Ligand binder design. Structure first.
Ligand code: HEM
Length: 354
């Protein structure tokens, strides 16, 4: 439902979706059957206003333990507080060199296998999955099978008995009794499944985006210090996480000048908020600060953004440096993108040569 919020022209918005955004940053959508009233939050400020408000929950409208996205306060707060330290700046700094080496491992395989390569399946996917295992602290003997399968309750209970390194070891060590096997397995699942999906798509589609702007491909090679800026601009432009689960108002609340009634559901379009403003939409990695909501906002703000930002920075900076002659093996116009859907936005394959 609301398929219009996912209509794209390759990487850009479809004219049908652009026309919808012209109806204002907040659009009232009464269902034809009269069963409910829905809202589209299409603007940067409105999306942030909706997602920051405490007067919305994430009820199901007309469930896995450890899935933070399906919890509201106070239970959401309880679980997020236990896992949040795994993403501290000190955690990411200690992890960076090991992530760099994993990225280098996969670009080593790439340069040795020789061209061409299907970048999505053969590089981006394995890279994101391997970085995920390292962050989680998966034992090396389990990573091969854990990746192929994406068992979990079995893996979670065992690691919980003998806590090791990574996020799962930290949680089990500091909150052993407060988190169950199923909840710990759920934390690991979200990281290995949706998180990898979104990260691998940024790696692949982001590479294509850089290739379609060769002046910036080289610029990031000349000036690797733009990496952090480039990541923000890439996730903004891609918007692989296009739309969010509905937020239902728990009471009458005024948003963007209009009154959202209790019980009405609001659908935030990160795609539209990140891309609808033609002024300053061009892809430009020299932008020192991007206006985007690709990682969400509020209490549900992407808990893995620190890892995602670091992994993508390392991946893109090392890629342009080790493969300055990189190019699509087919005309970029022939790349296939997944048809509109609530699923993560991604291309179907990315054949590359160099
Ligand atoms: C390092 C890889 C990633 C990890 C570990 C990760 C972990 C999560 C977690 C734990 C949540 C739940 C937050 C909560 O409800 O409290 C989440 C939701 C989200 N993630 Fe991912 N994520 C990852 C890659 C991404 C990337 C690359 C993006 C950017 C497109 C992303 C955009 C989101 C957004 C926007 C939400 C919030 C959805 C909503 O508000 O309904 N994530 N992620």
């Amino acid at each position: 439902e609301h398929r219009v919020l996912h209509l794209r022209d390759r990487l850009d918005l479809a004219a049908e979706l652009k026309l919808l955004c012209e109806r204002g940053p907040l659009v009232r959508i009464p269902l034809e059957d009269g069963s409910a009233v829905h809202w589209f939050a299409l603007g940067y400020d409105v999306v942030r206003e909706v997602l920051g408000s405490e007067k919305f929950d994430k009820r199901v409208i007309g469930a896995l333990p450890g899935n933070l996205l399906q919890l509201d306060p106070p239970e959401h707060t309880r679980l997020r507080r236990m896992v949040a330290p795994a993403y501290s700046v000190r955690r990411m700094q200690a992890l960076e060199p090991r992530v760099q080496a994993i990225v280098d491992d996969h670009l080593d395989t790439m340069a040795s296998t020789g061209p061409p390569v299907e970048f999505l399946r053969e590089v981006a996917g394995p890279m994101a999955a391997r970085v995920a295992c390292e962050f989680l602290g998966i034992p090396l003997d389990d990573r091969g099978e854990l990746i192929r399968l994406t068992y979990m309750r079995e893996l979670a209970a065992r690691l919980r008995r003998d806590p090791g390194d990574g996020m799962l070891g930290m949680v089990a060590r500091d909150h052993g009794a407060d988190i169950s096997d199923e909840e710990l397995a759920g934390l690991c699942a979200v990281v290995m499944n949706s998180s990898v999906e979104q990260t691998e798509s940024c790696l692949a589609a982001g590479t294509l985006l850089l290739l379609e702007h060769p002046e910036q491909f080289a610029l990031l090679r000349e000036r690797p210090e733009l990496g952090e800026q480039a990541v923000e601009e890439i996730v903004r432009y891609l918007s692989v996480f296009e739309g969010l689960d509905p937020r239902t108002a728990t009471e009458d609340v005024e948003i963007g000048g209009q009154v959202i009634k209790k019980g009405e559901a609001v659908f935030c379009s990160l795609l539209a908020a990140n891309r609808a403003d033609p002024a300053l939409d061009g892809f430009d990695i020299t932008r020192k600060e991007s206006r985007h909501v690709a990682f969400g906002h509020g209490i549900h703000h992407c808990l893995g953004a620190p890892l995602a930002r670091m992994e993508l920075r390392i991946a893109f900076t090392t890629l342009v440096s080790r493969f300055p002659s990189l190019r699509t093996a087919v005309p970029a116009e022939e790349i296939r993108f997944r048809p509109p859907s609530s699923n993560v936005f991604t291309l179907l394959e990315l054949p590359l040569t160099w």
